[PDB]
Structures are given as structure tokens and as C-alpha cells.
Amino acid sequence: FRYMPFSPAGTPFGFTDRRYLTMNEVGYVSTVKNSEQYSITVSFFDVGRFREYHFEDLFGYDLCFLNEKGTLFGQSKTGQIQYRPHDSIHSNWTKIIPLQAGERITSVAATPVRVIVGTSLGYFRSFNQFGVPFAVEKTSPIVALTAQNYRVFSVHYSQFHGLSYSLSELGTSSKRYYKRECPLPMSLPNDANLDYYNFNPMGIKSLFFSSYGDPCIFGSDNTLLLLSKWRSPEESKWLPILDSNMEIWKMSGGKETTDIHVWPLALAYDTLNCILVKGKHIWPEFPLPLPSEMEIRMPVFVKSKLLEENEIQIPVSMAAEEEYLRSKVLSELLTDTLENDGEMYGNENEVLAALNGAYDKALLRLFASACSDQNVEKALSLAHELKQDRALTAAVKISERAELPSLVKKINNIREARYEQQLK
């Protein structure tokens, strides 16, 4: 197996002399072949904040990582890296990574405080933002890296386990692992896009931390996977939170298309920032379209049932079930964030409050459908899952309006039982 240089959302040359080195919510980095060298362009989506620029690449950088403070470049065969801060206040710096025979740099990453380099032999080299080395570590062969502040999300590959991942924090002291080489349940590629899989054999279109700090990955199946409960090693699980193939299907009015593709940039809370690629190839071209937003949806919709209810229109009862599950997942993730790391983005407390509100509201709609179907047992189980005590009150009023007096008494037992915990 041959390790190819990986960068988030990078594209292959194909039949052109240009491609995108990397791409995320900050911007995009492209490279163009001219004469014998390369012309690299660093562009930004917030044009007012940073200025697009270009420079001549005499080394042939094939690895790149972009953040809000700088851009990191790497040369997979020679081992040379360069960090270029966006502001000219801070100076660029260059370093050459030692490489053994046949060893390549497979992935690089950078935050405002850390620079990470991973190799095909499993060498994990970390630096501060100025190039001061901190530690050289030997792990399993690395195929993809991403980072956010002091935390690193690494993907590994051997012939034994397949794909695994590690989750670590590079604090001011020693490197600590939250997760060490756990199974990565991302589907591996299994025709017109053969150039892409020669360029990216694992099919990892992109990976990143969410805006709230949760690791995400986006493979060839075009499904956004989010790692939940990663602070508890025994409770961590990967959650499919977006089937982008299904969303494109619903956007096309329920018609199977083969000309629209999703290119992932980032996950902002509940929205996937992406490029909607229209064309024969699954990767974006030149010029780059404006970024789009695709809201995440739990994969619970069935095409056959959606066709009977007719852009595709969703029945309010089926839409409530998805909204309940999505609010449940997002509420649990954000609660774990606030209970351990506190605020990062600045609106998490208000988002969580609205999140719990939408949770109970969607749950109450399912509760009304159960009452309409005279299913008192299913209604009681739905009432047990309610969060707010005022939502239990709303459920009582729906039960009275449905003339189910036995249900009213059982829901009032829930309210009394919670009020008893309030007395302890």
C-alpha cells in the first residue's frame, strides 16, 4: 500500500495544471504548474479580514493546512515545511523534516499554537507556531491529521486493523491521549472519478473539529460522521449526522441525480459549510463557487415514504421524529462541551437553551400523534423523555384535549416524582 499526501478537501490535478491544496471555512489554497515551478494562491472567504496573495513555490508543496492565523505547507518527498502567518507582523519560517528511506510526509496541521507533521512510518512531530520542536513520537502510520488549539485528531492505517484514530491534547506539559488507536468506522471506497481515488485512496474528503470541538470525518460515502462522548473512552461512538446524498436527493425534488456533489469545508454547530459541485467530477473546479450551507439531518428519512407525500415536502409527523433525534444528539454533545470545556464560540449557552426547547416541542408533536392513535403506552414513553417541567404540563393538556384520563394521571405522577427530587 502506498501512502498519498493528504490535505483537507484537497483536489487532484486531473487533466489540468492546477488543483486545490486545501480548503475549509477560512478559505482555499490553490497551486498552478508553470514552467518548472508552482504558483500558490491563498484566498479567503471573508475578503474584508485577510488579503488574498500569491507566491512562487520552488519546492512543489503537495501538503497544506489552513487556519485563521496562518497557512502551513509541506513537501511530501523532501520533508520541507513552511508556515506563513496571515498577518505580516509575524514572520514566515521554514524547516526540513528528516525522512528515512521511503518515508513520506502524509499530513500536516496547524493551529495558532501548534504545528503537526505526520509521516508514513508513524513519526509524529510537533512544534509551536514559531518552529520550536516539542517532541518526536512514534505511532502507527499516519494518513490524515487535523487540529484545533491544542488538540489533535489523527487517522492511522496498518495492514492489521484497517483504519483507526487517535485523539490527543498537546498541552504545555506532556501529550495526553483521550483515545488511542480506536476503530474508525468510516467506509472505505469500494469509475469516472478514478483520478480522485488514486489521489486519495482512503476516500477521506475532509476531516475537522467542529466549531464546538467535536471531531468529524467525511468519507467516500458522503456521510458526515461525528465522534460523540469522546471524553469518556468507554462511551465514545461515531454518529452519522448527515447523509448528503439524501439531502441532494431531497433538494432535487426526489429525483436521482449524478451531477451534484458535496465538498465538505466545516461543521458550524448544526450546519455543514460545503461547496456544491456541479459537473462530471466529484471535486470542485476553477473558479470556486461560493460556499453553501447544508443543515445536518439524522438519517431516518425513507425515500419511498417521502415519495408518497408528494423540492421534497416532508410530513410534519415524520419531520418531528427527525427533529427530536437531532435535537437530542446536539443537546447531548453541547452539554458535554459546556460541562467539561466551557464556552469556546460565545453563544453555546443560548444555543443549548434553544436546543432543549426544540427538543421538547418536537417530542410533544410525536406525543400528540400517539394520543391521536389512542396509543397510551407509546405516549407515556414519549412523555418520559421530555426535558422541561413546563413540557410535562403541556403534555397533560394535550392528554386532556385527547380525552385520555388514564394518561393524565400517569403523566402527573411523573411531575410529582420530579418535584420530589426537587425536595431533596
Binding site: L364, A368, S372, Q388, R390, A391, A394, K397, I398, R401
Partner: peptide, 15 residues
């Protein structure tokens, strides 16, 4: 039998 709940949901919105 569809049940009217929209008024109860708006009552839940009030803070």
C-alpha cells in the same frame, strides 16, 4: 382525530 396543540406549544414558548 387530529388534536389542536399549536396553542399549547405557543404557551410553552412564553418566558
Amino acid at each position: 382525530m387530529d388534536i389542536x396543540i399549536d396553542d399549547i406549544l405557543x404557551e410553552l414558548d412564553k418566558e
